[PDB]
Amino acid sequence: ATFEIVNRCSYTVWAAAVPGGGRQLNQGQSWTINVNAGTTGGRIWGRTGCSFDGSGRGRCQTGDCGGVLSCTAYGNPPNTLAEFALNQFNNLDFFDISLVDGFNVPMDFSPTSGGCRGIRCAADINGQCPGALKAPGGCNNPCTVFKTDQYCCNSGACSPTDYSQFFKRNCPDAYSYPKDDQTTTFTCPGGTNYRVVFCP
């Protein structure tokens, strides 16, 4: 499956992908990767406020993945997430934008190959972020900030909260909390190709 990642932000975004690694994308730059059929736990995101040395090690203000440029793991919140599991069930892709690990950059996550609709979360979440949730370069989900089960849901019991609803009101088609089931999961034919755009 083809995933094209495009930075339209004026600021640099260090794209990250599991699988795929990572790449600096200055404004206008793109990165195209081929993700294997059947991939689960797929995640693409942007990192901001990064500095890296010549050996690909350093740190990002948002979305940092263990201090490396070429990510081999998920990143530090806050980070807007494109999530996907390919060729599941009867050969169907499942994908979403998630704000469960916060927001940093506005995002469009859409199929390019036809057969289904896409997803966008491009409200100014950072600007409107509640004070309790604000982080450098982003807006954390209440799970990250408060570290309680009503938000984090490891018990398996959770429902919408006031703080999850801040995210949901502004991005209705994104996951706002771990068990969000309102217009949060999207499907496409198995083997669909996708594009993730930062600052769409």
Side-chain angles (χ1 to χ4, degrees), residues 3 16-20 33 35-36 38-45 73-74 81-86 88 94-98 109 196:
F3 285 73
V18 173
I33 58 174
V35 176
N36 290 338
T39 289
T40 58
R43 200 187 271 205
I44 287 162
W45 69 105
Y74 300 160
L81 301 179
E83 300 182 310
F84 52 93
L86 309 184
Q88 302 298 284
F94 287 74
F95 68 113
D96 61 82
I97 296 172
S98 173
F109 181 20
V196 173

Side-chain angles (χ1 to χ4, degrees), residues 75-183:
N76 290 4
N79 50 16
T80 307
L81 301 179
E83 300 182 310
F84 52 93
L86 309 184
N87 314 92
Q88 302 298 284
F89 299 101
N90 58 315
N91 196 23
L92 285 176
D93 295 351
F94 287 74
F95 68 113
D96 61 82
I97 296 172
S98 173
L99 305 178
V100 171
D101 292 339
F103 177 101
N104 65 339
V105 181
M107 177 178 285
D108 186 285
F109 181 20
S110 295
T112 54
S113 52
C116 45
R117 67 158 291 191
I119 322 176
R120 187 177 287 190
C121 177
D124 187 8
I125 293 304
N126 288 344
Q128 301 181 258
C129 192
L133 297 188
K134 198 67 192 47
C139 191
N140 275 317
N141 195 95
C143 173
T144 299
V145 180
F146 302 120
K147 306 161 142 57
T148 58
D149 190 75
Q150 101 182 100
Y151 300 123
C152 289
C153 204
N154 281 325
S155 70
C158 57
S159 57
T161 60
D162 289 334
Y163 274 129
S164 82
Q165 280 185 133
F166 161 72
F167 293 101
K168 198 63 169 179
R169 282 192 304 271
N170 290 292
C171 288
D173 293 337
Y175 270 87
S176 63
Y177 75 103
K179 294 183 119 189
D180 193 346
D181 74 350
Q182 298 297 290
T183 62

